Amino acid sequence: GSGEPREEAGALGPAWDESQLRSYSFPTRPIPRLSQSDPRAEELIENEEPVVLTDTNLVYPALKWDLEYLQENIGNGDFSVYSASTHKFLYYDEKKMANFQNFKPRSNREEMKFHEFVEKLQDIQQRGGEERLYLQQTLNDTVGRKIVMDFLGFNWNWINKQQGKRGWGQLTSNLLLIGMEGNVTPAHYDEQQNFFAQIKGYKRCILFPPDQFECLYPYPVHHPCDRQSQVDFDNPDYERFPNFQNVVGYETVVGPGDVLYIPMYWWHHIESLLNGGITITVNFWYKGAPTPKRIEYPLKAHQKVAIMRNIEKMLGEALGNPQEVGPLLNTMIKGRYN
Amino acid sequence: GSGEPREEAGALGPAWDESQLRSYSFPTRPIPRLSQSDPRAEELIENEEPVVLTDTNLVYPALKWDLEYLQENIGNGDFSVYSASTHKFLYYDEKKMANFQNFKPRSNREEMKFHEFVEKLQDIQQRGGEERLYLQQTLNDTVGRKIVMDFLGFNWNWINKQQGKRGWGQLTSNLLLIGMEGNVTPAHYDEQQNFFAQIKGYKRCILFPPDQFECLYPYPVHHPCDRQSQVDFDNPDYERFPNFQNVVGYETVVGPGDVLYIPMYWWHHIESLLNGGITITVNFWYKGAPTPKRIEYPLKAHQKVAIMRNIEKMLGEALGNPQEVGPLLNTMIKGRYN
Ligand SMILES: O=C(O)Cc1cs/c(=N\C(=O)CCNS(=O)(=O)c2ccccc2)n1O
Ligand SMILES: O=C(O)Cc1cs/c(=N\C(=O)CCNS(=O)(=O)c2ccccc2)n1O
Ligand SMILES: [Zn+2]
Ligand SMILES: [Zn+2]
């Protein structure tokens, strides 16, 4: 899996041990941990394969962040805070809830000030409760000046050269992630390039390449859980998702100062280590490089994923109702392509 | 089925008896036999439902045609003549044979002069052979003057008013069909409006509306047998085509002077009656009325058929190879829409 856990400097003991990792049915192989000076890492990023960069200093001024420093300087803005009854957080598109009334949310969002989220957090911890919170908020301009200069201290020289050397679109947003220990963002894929910059705590990252689409069974494109796996990693229904017995992931554990390149359309399962405290992450999202003019075959796996996405979308608009997409596709293939 | 067989004028006995009809597994109901003066027939054509018109006089000058008269006056042109080992004639798109090398033809076309087709026909009949021929040739300008004035004697006044009253495109071709008794054109659908004008002999016509697509399992759009049913009507494989046990057809027997409106996208199975002699038919093909601007829901069954056709076609061009259309569609629906 994540291999032997790393030893921290000053003989401060192992960063983590295997008992902080949850258990799953599939095998994993390690994502390489390299230096940004190492051309191997430059090659993996160009080939859109994940790599963990150990020395970008991307969010070096942010490494001092904790709950106290942030609450004092983050400002008086509103922060999206997602609550969950269990460790699996259930995210959904609230716009697409119009198409699936038979879908009930179990992880609702709540806007609140940063001091309210910290108050609500220690309230759960002193009460011994089991409710979980996950703060996910795009950084805007309403943030204090001390956090502003921390932001200015990011290694923009390195990441901008990466944005230009790959031909990516410009940075779209910076997402701040403050999660509780044991929190799980279940497997899903994103449509942009991601630099996963870990700040506080450790996160286990399990990635699946786009060519394992048929092993991970994403929800219908019109479903509020579009881009998420239907497979319950904790209780995989092998009768509904038989190819999940063939899935094989890429695994790593990122700590403070580590930066994980999650390529676009790559599945990822992110969990904050059990009994590891709160985790802090900042994501850098870039739109992928524009699709080239000369179409070259064979197609990349992610290009076929985009094709299936658009067939579903266009079929939903053509039939006038997304709920008829399913039966028409079965009509199209039953006894004709299977 | 076709109901009680009609009695011919002058007490010349029944036109046909049930023993000339082949046997099939599905039930049928009769296509109405009306007069073109009857507004009910005008309503069926407008609703794109089949009707048999008994008194159009559409091909009145052609009713005198037989093998001898045609051979003398049809001219010295080349006629497409399809040969078959069995009663089921196997038609295919020769352009699409590039995609399915694993497909071998069993009914080859042969160009020949009209006198050669008649010579080859009586050759089979005197030899007692079982090889079958089917002449199918679009009428052109290379045809003799006596046939030209027969053509001019067609009821263009009636059929042109029908072409205008429905908003159809112009006439695209006239197909002459001369078949042997027992010949079968297996079930398929056409993309144009058809006026089926019977001249000599009797043909049993079995039609299925477009909403029975999932009962009739057409070949993949890129297959040389695109638009034909994969179901062998003589030996239906219920394990591969289970919804064929739900199919229900519309049946009629057309004779000399009868005109059958086969609406666009309607399946049809056409067989020349057993022991009925040669059959002669002329088809009038019109492109359907252009799709209206304001898209109105619910969609017609044939509109959904066009949607599935175009998804298959566009997917074949996007992937660069029609043979990958199947696996991608299964990947798209397996565990996601079924
Ligand atoms: O818990 C963890 O640490 C993992 C985690 C927290 S949030 C997350 N993903 C998203 O929020 C979706 C991004 N989708 S996007 O199309 O690329 C996009 C859309 C809009 C702006 C910018 C980008 N992951 O994987
Ligand atoms: O044996 C019988 O009596 C039945 C019979 C003989 S041929 C036949 N069908 C076709 O040849 C296909 C027409 N397809 S089309 O798209 O509308 C079209 C294409 C090009 C020009 C004009 C029209 N049927 O059903
Ligand atoms: Zn993500
Ligand atoms: Zn036809």
Tab-separated table of N, CA and C in Angstrom, chain A residues 25 32 35 41 58 98 113 122 129 134 150 153 159 167 178 203 211 221 237 240 249 271 285 293 299 311 335:
chain	number	residue	atom	x	y	z
A	25	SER	N	-11.047	-3.829	0.118
A	25	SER	CA	-10.979	-5.131	-0.536
A	25	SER	C	-9.958	-5.197	-1.662
A	32	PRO	N	4.612	7.359	-6.428
A	32	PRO	CA	6.001	7.725	-6.126
A	32	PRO	C	6.088	9.043	-5.370
A	35	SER	N	11.167	14.487	-5.672
A	35	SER	CA	11.474	15.900	-5.548
A	35	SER	C	11.142	16.614	-6.850
A	41	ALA	N	9.583	13.170	-11.766
A	41	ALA	CA	8.329	13.807	-11.382
A	41	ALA	C	7.812	14.705	-12.495
A	58	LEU	N	5.239	24.789	-1.712
A	58	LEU	CA	4.111	25.463	-2.345
A	58	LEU	C	3.319	26.274	-1.329
A	98	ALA	N	-33.409	18.337	-8.699
A	98	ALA	CA	-34.722	18.464	-9.319
A	98	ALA	C	-35.101	17.213	-10.103
A	113	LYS	N	-19.724	31.318	10.288
A	113	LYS	CA	-18.451	31.992	10.483
A	113	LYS	C	-17.421	31.015	11.043
A	122	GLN	N	-15.425	21.754	18.929
A	122	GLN	CA	-15.108	21.359	20.298
A	122	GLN	C	-16.362	20.982	21.077
A	129	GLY	N	-19.653	13.186	21.171
A	129	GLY	CA	-20.513	12.844	20.058
A	129	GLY	C	-19.752	12.202	18.916
A	134	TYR	N	-16.941	18.849	8.069
A	134	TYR	CA	-15.915	19.038	7.047
A	134	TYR	C	-16.064	20.449	6.496
A	150	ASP	N	0.414	35.317	3.892
A	150	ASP	CA	0.678	33.883	3.804
A	150	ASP	C	0.417	33.381	2.390
A	153	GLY	N	3.045	34.329	0.090
A	153	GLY	CA	4.230	33.523	0.287
A	153	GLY	C	4.210	32.159	-0.365
A	159	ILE	N	4.631	26.829	-9.266
A	159	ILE	CA	3.363	26.311	-9.770
A	159	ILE	C	2.945	27.021	-11.053
A	167	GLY	N	0.537	23.711	-20.426
A	167	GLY	CA	-0.495	24.318	-21.242
A	167	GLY	C	-1.857	24.366	-20.592
A	178	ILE	N	-10.603	21.716	5.885
A	178	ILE	CA	-10.307	21.410	7.280
A	178	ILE	C	-11.256	20.300	7.699
A	203	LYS	N	-3.299	12.669	5.344
A	203	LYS	CA	-4.418	12.160	4.566
A	203	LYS	C	-3.951	10.988	3.720
A	211	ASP	N	-8.992	4.592	-16.791
A	211	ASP	CA	-9.346	3.373	-17.516
A	211	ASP	C	-10.060	2.346	-16.645
A	221	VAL	N	-25.051	10.698	-15.129
A	221	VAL	CA	-24.565	12.072	-15.210
A	221	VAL	C	-25.598	13.054	-14.662
A	237	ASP	N	-21.035	-4.166	-2.981
A	237	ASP	CA	-22.061	-5.071	-3.500
A	237	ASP	C	-21.537	-5.682	-4.793
A	240	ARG	N	-24.060	-6.144	-7.806
A	240	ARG	CA	-24.359	-4.980	-8.630
A	240	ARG	C	-23.126	-4.421	-9.323
A	249	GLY	N	-5.872	0.254	-7.010
A	249	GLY	CA	-5.635	1.661	-6.780
A	249	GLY	C	-4.163	2.024	-6.649
A	271	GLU	N	-9.089	10.074	2.710
A	271	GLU	CA	-9.515	9.902	4.090
A	271	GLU	C	-8.481	10.509	5.025
A	285	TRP	N	-6.757	24.296	-8.391
A	285	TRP	CA	-7.498	23.749	-9.519
A	285	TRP	C	-7.152	24.515	-10.788
A	293	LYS	N	-6.148	20.043	-31.860
A	293	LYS	CA	-6.900	20.104	-33.109
A	293	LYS	C	-6.897	18.754	-33.819
A	299	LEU	N	-7.661	6.802	-28.487
A	299	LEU	CA	-8.066	7.838	-27.554
A	299	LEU	C	-7.566	7.520	-26.152
A	311	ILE	N	-22.791	11.966	-24.301
A	311	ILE	CA	-23.919	11.199	-24.822
A	311	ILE	C	-25.070	11.219	-23.825
A	335	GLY	N	-29.767	-6.969	-26.748
A	335	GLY	CA	-29.857	-7.823	-27.912
A	335	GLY	C	-29.266	-7.242	-29.175
